[PDB]
Amino acid sequence: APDSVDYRKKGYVTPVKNQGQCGSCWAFSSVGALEGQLKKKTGKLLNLSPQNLVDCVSENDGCGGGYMTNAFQYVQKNRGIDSEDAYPYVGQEESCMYNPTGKAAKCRGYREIPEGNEKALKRAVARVGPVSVAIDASLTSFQFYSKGVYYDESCNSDNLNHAVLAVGYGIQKGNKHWIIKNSWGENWGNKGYILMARNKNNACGIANLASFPKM
Ligand SMILES: *C(#N)C1=NC([C][C][C])=[C]C(C2=[C]C(C(F)(F)F)=[C]C(C(=O)N([C][C]N([C])[C])[C]C3=[C][C]=[C][C]=[C]3)=[C]2)=N1
């Protein structure tokens, strides 16, 4: 695998979104992974619909949280996911709507990364594209991140409470990192992104619940 990967440089990553008043991080993480695969398959970069997932993935709890694997499974069973334009984001759970011409991507299943294995996560990011990951984002140091390679020894790898998207990896001034796209707007972190410590004993649980969709 390469030493450094950044899918933003290849045009595989859409603009940073803002989930607003809804605990729908999982839907943003899921659509980000789908968007990367759609770009890889077709050449098209476009916004897929987190709202379609919030409203329709009945195994998840809409604005009260969810898993990305449940989302991928839904998109597969549903035979598609709508574009953002067809099924726009409203930031509250509503009834599941059917748009006859709304479909913009499909999913053929998913794979999970071996639990806790950062080398395996790296290899998947290199081979596949952006990968959905879960982390402990509960610390003030994370919430108020602005710069650098984030590491806090108080982060709890077993407290997975936020879903984000690994869009690459690399090294900054000798500190290995994951490049992480959040869904709290461009005004959060570094233009909506955070660099998280890599190969520091699975810091914040970054490799504990990682998955990517098949397309
Ligand atoms: C985002 N946004 C976000 N916000 C909250 C708090 C506001 C609702 C919680 C979560 C969340 C993330 C994750 C993840 F992605 F990190 F893994 C997991 C959960 C969660 O606790 N789940 C249940 C855990 N167990 C039953 C052991 C996942 C879940 C939640 C609801 C329905 C299905 C699955 C929460 N993200």
Side-chain angles (χ1 to χ4, degrees), residues 5 25 33 36 58 87 90 100 103 113 124 139 156 162 164 184 189 195 198:
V5 168
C25 57
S58 62
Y87 202 145
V90 294
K103 192 186 302 194
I113 302 317
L139 301 178
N156 189 347
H162 189 53
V164 293
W184 290 343
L195 301 184
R198 179 163 64 85

PDB file of all heavy atoms in Angstrom, residues 5 25 33 36 58 87 90 100 103 113 124 139 156 162 164 184 189 195 198:
ATOM      1  N   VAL A   5      -2.181   8.290   1.255  1.00  0.00           N
ATOM      2  CA  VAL A   5      -3.325   8.273   0.345  1.00  0.00           C
ATOM      3  C   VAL A   5      -4.206   9.442   0.761  1.00  0.00           C
ATOM      4  O   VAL A   5      -4.380   9.670   1.951  1.00  0.00           O
ATOM      5  CB  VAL A   5      -4.147   6.972   0.485  1.00  0.00           C
ATOM      6  CG1 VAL A   5      -5.485   7.095  -0.241  1.00  0.00           C
ATOM      7  CG2 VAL A   5      -3.326   5.749   0.011  1.00  0.00           C
ATOM      8  N   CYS A  25     -24.903  11.161  12.074  1.00  0.00           N
ATOM      9  CA  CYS A  25     -23.514  10.964  11.629  1.00  0.00           C
ATOM     10  C   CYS A  25     -23.349   9.676  10.812  1.00  0.00           C
ATOM     11  O   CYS A  25     -22.640   9.654   9.793  1.00  0.00           O
ATOM     12  CB  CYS A  25     -22.563  10.949  12.824  1.00  0.00           C
ATOM     13  SG  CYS A  25     -22.941   9.706  14.072  1.00  0.00           S
ATOM     14  N   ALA A  33     -18.953   6.935   2.040  1.00  0.00           N
ATOM     15  CA  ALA A  33     -18.336   5.698   1.529  1.00  0.00           C
ATOM     16  C   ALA A  33     -18.983   5.311   0.184  1.00  0.00           C
ATOM     17  O   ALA A  33     -18.300   4.967  -0.785  1.00  0.00           O
ATOM     18  CB  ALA A  33     -18.443   4.555   2.580  1.00  0.00           C
ATOM     19  N   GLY A  36     -17.771   7.625  -2.657  1.00  0.00           N
ATOM     20  CA  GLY A  36     -16.427   7.290  -3.119  1.00  0.00           C
ATOM     21  C   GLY A  36     -16.455   6.137  -4.116  1.00  0.00           C
ATOM     22  O   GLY A  36     -15.805   6.194  -5.157  1.00  0.00           O
ATOM     23  N   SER A  58     -34.762   1.068   8.926  1.00  0.00           N
ATOM     24  CA  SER A  58     -35.524   0.782  10.145  1.00  0.00           C
ATOM     25  C   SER A  58     -34.744   0.086  11.271  1.00  0.00           C
ATOM     26  O   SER A  58     -35.135   0.185  12.439  1.00  0.00           O
ATOM     27  CB  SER A  58     -36.806   0.007   9.790  1.00  0.00           C
ATOM     28  OG  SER A  58     -36.489  -1.233   9.202  1.00  0.00           O
ATOM     29  N   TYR A  87     -33.840  13.546  -2.785  1.00  0.00           N
ATOM     30  CA  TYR A  87     -34.302  13.197  -1.435  1.00  0.00           C
ATOM     31  C   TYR A  87     -33.478  14.042  -0.462  1.00  0.00           C
ATOM     32  O   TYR A  87     -32.550  13.544   0.186  1.00  0.00           O
ATOM     33  CB  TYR A  87     -34.129  11.684  -1.192  1.00  0.00           C
ATOM     34  CG  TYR A  87     -34.987  11.064  -0.108  1.00  0.00           C
ATOM     35  CD1 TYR A  87     -35.478   9.762  -0.245  1.00  0.00           C
ATOM     36  CD2 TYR A  87     -35.309  11.750   1.048  1.00  0.00           C
ATOM     37  CE1 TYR A  87     -36.249   9.173   0.739  1.00  0.00           C
ATOM     38  CE2 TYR A  87     -36.084  11.169   2.027  1.00  0.00           C
ATOM     39  CZ  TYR A  87     -36.558   9.887   1.871  1.00  0.00           C
ATOM     40  OH  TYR A  87     -37.335   9.312   2.854  1.00  0.00           O
ATOM     41  N   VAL A  90     -33.362  17.149   5.635  1.00  0.00           N
ATOM     42  CA  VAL A  90     -34.184  18.030   6.454  1.00  0.00           C
ATOM     43  C   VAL A  90     -33.823  17.988   7.948  1.00  0.00           C
ATOM     44  O   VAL A  90     -34.301  18.812   8.712  1.00  0.00           O
ATOM     45  CB  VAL A  90     -35.693  17.760   6.207  1.00  0.00           C
ATOM     46  CG1 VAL A  90     -36.050  18.152   4.777  1.00  0.00           C
ATOM     47  CG2 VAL A  90     -36.063  16.306   6.468  1.00  0.00           C
ATOM     48  N   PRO A 100     -39.803   7.676  -7.618  1.00  0.00           N
ATOM     49  CA  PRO A 100     -39.632   6.819  -8.793  1.00  0.00           C
ATOM     50  C   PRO A 100     -38.384   7.048  -9.635  1.00  0.00           C
ATOM     51  O   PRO A 100     -37.854   6.081 -10.206  1.00  0.00           O
ATOM     52  CB  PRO A 100     -40.904   7.075  -9.624  1.00  0.00           C
ATOM     53  CG  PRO A 100     -41.925   7.447  -8.612  1.00  0.00           C
ATOM     54  CD  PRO A 100     -41.186   8.183  -7.508  1.00  0.00           C
ATOM     55  N   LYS A 103     -33.203   7.270  -7.733  1.00  0.00           N
ATOM     56  CA  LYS A 103     -32.043   6.392  -7.495  1.00  0.00           C
ATOM     57  C   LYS A 103     -30.761   6.892  -8.161  1.00  0.00           C
ATOM     58  O   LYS A 103     -30.765   7.190  -9.337  1.00  0.00           O
ATOM     59  CB  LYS A 103     -32.351   4.994  -8.009  1.00  0.00           C
ATOM     60  CG  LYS A 103     -31.363   3.926  -7.574  1.00  0.00           C
ATOM     61  CD  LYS A 103     -31.632   2.575  -8.228  1.00  0.00           C
ATOM     62  CE  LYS A 103     -33.034   2.020  -7.959  1.00  0.00           C
ATOM     63  NZ  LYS A 103     -33.183   0.552  -8.308  1.00  0.00           N
ATOM     64  N   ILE A 113     -13.714  -4.448   8.340  1.00  0.00           N
ATOM     65  CA  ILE A 113     -12.291  -4.537   8.560  1.00  0.00           C
ATOM     66  C   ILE A 113     -12.091  -5.326   9.844  1.00  0.00           C
ATOM     67  O   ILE A 113     -12.811  -5.105  10.827  1.00  0.00           O
ATOM     68  CB  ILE A 113     -11.665  -3.106   8.719  1.00  0.00           C
ATOM     69  CG1 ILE A 113     -11.942  -2.234   7.471  1.00  0.00           C
ATOM     70  CG2 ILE A 113     -10.185  -3.190   9.128  1.00  0.00           C
ATOM     71  CD1 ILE A 113     -11.771  -2.889   6.125  1.00  0.00           C
ATOM     72  N   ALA A 124      -7.284  -1.443   3.372  1.00  0.00           N
ATOM     73  CA  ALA A 124      -8.607  -1.243   2.797  1.00  0.00           C
ATOM     74  C   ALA A 124      -8.766   0.158   2.213  1.00  0.00           C
ATOM     75  O   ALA A 124      -9.275   0.315   1.110  1.00  0.00           O
ATOM     76  CB  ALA A 124      -9.698  -1.538   3.829  1.00  0.00           C
ATOM     77  N   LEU A 139     -14.615  13.281  23.911  1.00  0.00           N
ATOM     78  CA  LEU A 139     -13.699  14.172  24.625  1.00  0.00           C
ATOM     79  C   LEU A 139     -13.775  15.591  24.122  1.00  0.00           C
ATOM     80  O   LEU A 139     -13.949  15.847  22.938  1.00  0.00           O
ATOM     81  CB  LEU A 139     -12.257  13.689  24.545  1.00  0.00           C
ATOM     82  CG  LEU A 139     -11.987  12.291  25.098  1.00  0.00           C
ATOM     83  CD1 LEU A 139     -10.514  11.930  24.894  1.00  0.00           C
ATOM     84  CD2 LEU A 139     -12.390  12.196  26.548  1.00  0.00           C
ATOM     85  N   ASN A 156     -11.356   6.497  24.590  1.00  0.00           N
ATOM     86  CA  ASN A 156     -11.763   5.138  24.914  1.00  0.00           C
ATOM     87  C   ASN A 156     -12.159   4.350  23.664  1.00  0.00           C
ATOM     88  O   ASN A 156     -13.259   4.522  23.132  1.00  0.00           O
ATOM     89  CB  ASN A 156     -12.928   5.174  25.913  1.00  0.00           C
ATOM     90  CG  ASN A 156     -13.277   3.817  26.456  1.00  0.00           C
ATOM     91  OD1 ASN A 156     -12.837   2.780  25.940  1.00  0.00           O
ATOM     92  ND2 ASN A 156     -14.072   3.807  27.527  1.00  0.00           N
ATOM     93  N   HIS A 162     -19.518   7.947  17.631  1.00  0.00           N
ATOM     94  CA  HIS A 162     -19.599   8.866  16.494  1.00  0.00           C
ATOM     95  C   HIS A 162     -19.074   8.161  15.237  1.00  0.00           C
ATOM     96  O   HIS A 162     -18.121   7.379  15.309  1.00  0.00           O
ATOM     97  CB  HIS A 162     -18.798  10.144  16.781  1.00  0.00           C
ATOM     98  CG  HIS A 162     -18.994  11.232  15.774  1.00  0.00           C
ATOM     99  ND1 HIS A 162     -20.239  11.695  15.407  1.00  0.00           N
ATOM    100  CD2 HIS A 162     -18.098  11.944  15.048  1.00  0.00           C
ATOM    101  CE1 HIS A 162     -20.099  12.638  14.487  1.00  0.00           C
ATOM    102  NE2 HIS A 162     -18.810  12.811  14.255  1.00  0.00           N
ATOM    103  N   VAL A 164     -17.771   8.595  11.222  1.00  0.00           N
ATOM    104  CA  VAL A 164     -17.045   9.500  10.340  1.00  0.00           C
ATOM    105  C   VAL A 164     -16.513   8.706   9.137  1.00  0.00           C
ATOM    106  O   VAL A 164     -16.818   7.529   8.984  1.00  0.00           O
ATOM    107  CB  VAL A 164     -15.918  10.265  11.114  1.00  0.00           C
ATOM    108  CG1 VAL A 164     -16.540  11.225  12.143  1.00  0.00           C
ATOM    109  CG2 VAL A 164     -14.949   9.280  11.821  1.00  0.00           C
ATOM    110  N   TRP A 184     -19.993  17.879  10.663  1.00  0.00           N
ATOM    111  CA  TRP A 184     -20.390  18.953  11.549  1.00  0.00           C
ATOM    112  C   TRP A 184     -20.134  20.315  10.878  1.00  0.00           C
ATOM    113  O   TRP A 184     -19.980  21.339  11.557  1.00  0.00           O
ATOM    114  CB  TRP A 184     -19.609  18.838  12.854  1.00  0.00           C
ATOM    115  CG  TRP A 184     -19.976  17.685  13.713  1.00  0.00           C
ATOM    116  CD1 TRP A 184     -21.099  16.923  13.648  1.00  0.00           C
ATOM    117  CD2 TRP A 184     -19.222  17.192  14.826  1.00  0.00           C
ATOM    118  NE1 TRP A 184     -21.091  15.974  14.649  1.00  0.00           N
ATOM    119  CE2 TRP A 184     -19.943  16.110  15.377  1.00  0.00           C
ATOM    120  CE3 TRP A 184     -18.006  17.559  15.403  1.00  0.00           C
ATOM    121  CZ2 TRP A 184     -19.477  15.382  16.481  1.00  0.00           C
ATOM    122  CZ3 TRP A 184     -17.538  16.832  16.498  1.00  0.00           C
ATOM    123  CH2 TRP A 184     -18.278  15.761  17.022  1.00  0.00           C
ATOM    124  N   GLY A 189     -13.435  21.886  13.133  1.00  0.00           N
ATOM    125  CA  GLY A 189     -12.097  21.352  12.902  1.00  0.00           C
ATOM    126  C   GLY A 189     -11.294  22.127  11.882  1.00  0.00           C
ATOM    127  O   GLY A 189     -11.290  23.374  11.872  1.00  0.00           O
ATOM    128  N   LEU A 195      -7.231  15.251  11.484  1.00  0.00           N
ATOM    129  CA  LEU A 195      -6.193  14.239  11.353  1.00  0.00           C
ATOM    130  C   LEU A 195      -6.140  13.513  12.684  1.00  0.00           C
ATOM    131  O   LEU A 195      -5.948  14.156  13.719  1.00  0.00           O
ATOM    132  CB  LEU A 195      -4.828  14.862  11.024  1.00  0.00           C
ATOM    133  CG  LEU A 195      -4.745  15.691   9.740  1.00  0.00           C
ATOM    134  CD1 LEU A 195      -3.314  16.156   9.519  1.00  0.00           C
ATOM    135  CD2 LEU A 195      -5.226  14.869   8.540  1.00  0.00           C
ATOM    136  N   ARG A 198      -2.558   7.660  13.902  1.00  0.00           N
ATOM    137  CA  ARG A 198      -2.504   6.333  13.328  1.00  0.00           C
ATOM    138  C   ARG A 198      -1.326   5.555  13.926  1.00  0.00           C
ATOM    139  O   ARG A 198      -0.243   6.115  14.159  1.00  0.00           O
ATOM    140  CB  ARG A 198      -2.341   6.446  11.805  1.00  0.00           C
ATOM    141  CG  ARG A 198      -2.248   5.098  11.073  1.00  0.00           C
ATOM    142  CD  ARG A 198      -2.511   5.303   9.568  1.00  0.00           C
ATOM    143  NE  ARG A 198      -1.478   6.142   8.952  1.00  0.00           N
ATOM    144  CZ  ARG A 198      -0.314   5.686   8.493  1.00  0.00           C
ATOM    145  NH1 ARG A 198      -0.002   4.399   8.556  1.00  0.00           N
ATOM    146  NH2 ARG A 198       0.539   6.539   7.968  1.00  0.00           N
TER     147      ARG A 198
END
